[PDB]
Amino acid sequence: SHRKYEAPRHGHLGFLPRKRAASIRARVKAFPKDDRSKPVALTSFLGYKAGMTTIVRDLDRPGSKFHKREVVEAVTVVDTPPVVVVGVVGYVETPRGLRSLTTVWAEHLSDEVKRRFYKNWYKSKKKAFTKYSAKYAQDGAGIERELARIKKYASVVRVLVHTQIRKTPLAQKKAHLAEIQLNGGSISEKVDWAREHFEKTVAVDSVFEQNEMIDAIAVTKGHGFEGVTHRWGTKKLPRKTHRGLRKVACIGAWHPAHVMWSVARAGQRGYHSRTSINHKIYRVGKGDDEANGATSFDRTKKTITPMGGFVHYGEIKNDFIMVKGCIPGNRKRIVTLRKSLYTNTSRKALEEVSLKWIDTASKFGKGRFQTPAEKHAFMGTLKKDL
């Protein structure tokens, strides 16, 4: 018989299977559409989620009742040390999709990137790209012809980059390596830009700018095996339920004589790769700068790091991206930012944002003070101070 009262479906079927991700770095499944008019630029960037804080900004929404009034918003900080370009690769378009035909690496690879090709680095001869380096040091022979091959073929070019993991307070020592699509000029211009940028660094402001809506791609925080009640949001059964009540009562009718795929069941929660779109960049902050946390209204020279550092992360001595809201993934996780795949006007992606004040109080508790100078001025002298 029919279900007595209608109710919406618990959970979303387009986020199936709810399994662990393949890798800890989420894959960029799609890049912005290219145009052969703009200069050669990247389409994505790599950073590490450092934590959240609050800002205060004056809202400019002509029609809201809080127009030209101050609001506080939750932002998240992505520590982005400047990435390093080591290698490019091109893709020809077959009737079976895109296919890589070549990979041209830079001559000198750093230890933090060539640790990625090792599981036991401490007991190794470190022989990696040593014959490719001997393929270098001639005029150009074993490199320039593959570059010309990418020019002759390969109607989509991707640049191999790697993070600078030693510039972050993480204890990993093994950088993350990824491909970023180029979205400017012809194939020759793309590969010439890459060849010029071999063994060289790219800063985050060369690709992103303020008030730009971006997409955050990351693997969410893991929670292990989880029951159906929290995994899918089903209703808890009543109190006098034998054999437990954090379950689904009916897992299917008699016919079809099978448990359906659409029945909510227990399993892994978290550690899924997610892509959250339409996140406005509020500040492209420079690490080569004091007063990162200062605004034109605050004007007290304090960096973006809170008191006592970021919880479980550390300091933000490098450049960073302050982006509005929540992004998937926890702290210390590699996070791939991406430009928007379409142009959104919406009267919200076009809003220019100027910050008034940034919170730098301690996140290790109910922090009262933004700076140690303010703390000492309020509290006076102590017993340790003489």
Partner 1 sequence: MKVEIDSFSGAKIYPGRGTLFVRGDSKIFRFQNSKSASLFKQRKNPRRIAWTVLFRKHHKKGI
Partner 2 sequence: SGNGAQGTKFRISLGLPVGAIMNCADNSGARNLYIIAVKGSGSRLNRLPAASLGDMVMATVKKGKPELRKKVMPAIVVRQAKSWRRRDGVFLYFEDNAGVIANPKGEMKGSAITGPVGKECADLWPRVASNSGVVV
Partner RNA sequence: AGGAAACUCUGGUGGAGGCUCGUAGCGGUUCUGACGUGCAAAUCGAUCGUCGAAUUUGGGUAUAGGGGCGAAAGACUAAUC
Partner RNA sequence: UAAGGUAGCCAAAUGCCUCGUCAUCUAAUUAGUGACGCGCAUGAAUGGAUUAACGAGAUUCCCACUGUCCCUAUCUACUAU
Partner RNA sequence: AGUCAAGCGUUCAUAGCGACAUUGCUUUUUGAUUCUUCGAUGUCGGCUCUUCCUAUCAUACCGAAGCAGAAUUCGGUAAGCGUUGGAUUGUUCACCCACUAAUAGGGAACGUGAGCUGGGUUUAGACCGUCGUGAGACAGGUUAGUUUUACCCUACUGAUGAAUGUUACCGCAAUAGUAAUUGAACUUAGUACGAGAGGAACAGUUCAUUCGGAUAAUUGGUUUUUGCGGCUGUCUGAUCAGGCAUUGCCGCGAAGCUACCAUCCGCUGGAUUAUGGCUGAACGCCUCUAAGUCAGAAUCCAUGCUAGAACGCGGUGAUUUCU
Nearest-approach distance from CB 7 to partner 2, in angstroms: 4
Report the site for partner 2 in 27-56 (rule: CB under 8 A): 54
Give the number of residues in contact with RNA, rule: CB under 7 A.
140
Residue 363 near Mg ion by CB under 5 A: yes
Residue 274: contacted member of partner 1, partner 2, RNA, none (CB under 5 to 8 Å, by partner type): RNA
Using the rule CB under 7 A, which residue among 276, 295, 300, 354 binds RNA? 276
The 227-256 site mask, x for binding RNA (CB under 7 A), equals --xx-xxxxxxxxxxxx--xxxxxxxxxxx
Among 12, 125, 131, 242, indicate the residue that binds Mg ion (CB under 5 A): 242
Contact pattern from residue 210 through residue 239 relative to partner 2, giving x for each residue in contact according to CB under 8 A and a dash for the rest? -------------------------x----
d(CA 39, CA 378): 53
Q: Are 184 and 190 in contact (CB under 8 A)?
A: yes
Site size toward partner 2 (CB under 8 A) is 13
The 3-state secondary structure of the chain reads CCCCCCCCCCCCHHHCCCCCCCCCCCCCCCCCCCCCCCCCCECEEEEEEEEEEEEEEEECCECECCCCEEEEEEEEEEECCCEEEEEEEEEEEECCEEEECCCECCCCCCHHHHCCCCCCCCCCCCCCCHHHHHHCCCCCHHHHHHHHHHHHCCCEEEEEEECCHHHCCCCCCCCCEEEEEECCCCHHHHHHHHHHCCCEEECHHHCCCCCCEEEEEEECCCCEEECHHHHHCCCCCCCCCCCCCCCCCCCCCCCCCCCCCCCCCCEEECCCEEEEEEEEEEEEECCCCCCCCCCCCCCCCCCCCCCCCECCCECCCCCEEEEECCCCCCCCCEEEEEECCCCCCCCCCCCCCCEEEECCCCCCCCCCCCCHHHHHHHHCCCCCCC
Residues 202-221 that bind RNA (CB under 7 A): 217, 220-221
Count of residues touching partner 1 (by CB under 8 A)? 14
For the segment 353-372, give every residue that binds partner 1 (CB under 8 A). Answer: 356-357, 359, 361, 366, 368-370
CB of 68 to partner 2, least distance (A): 13
Q: Closer to Mg ion at the Cβ: 2 or 131?
A: 2
Does 249 bind partner 2 (CB under 8 A)? Our answer is: no
Instruction: Pick what 69 binds: partner 2, partner 1, RNA, none; C-beta below 5 to 8 Å, kind-dependent.
Output: partner 2
CB-nearer residue toward Mg ion: 184 or 222: 222
Query: Is residue 54 a contact point for RNA (CB under 7 A)?
Result: yes
**Does 380 help bind RNA (rule: CB under 7 A)?**
no
Please say which residue, 94 or 296, places its beta carbon nearer to partner 1. Answer: 296
Query: Shortest gap between Cβ of 374 and partner 1 (angstroms)?
Result: 8
Residues near partner 2 (CB under 8 A) are 5-8, 54, 59, 65-66, 69-72, 235
Residues near Mg ion (CB under 5 A) are 1-2, 242, 363
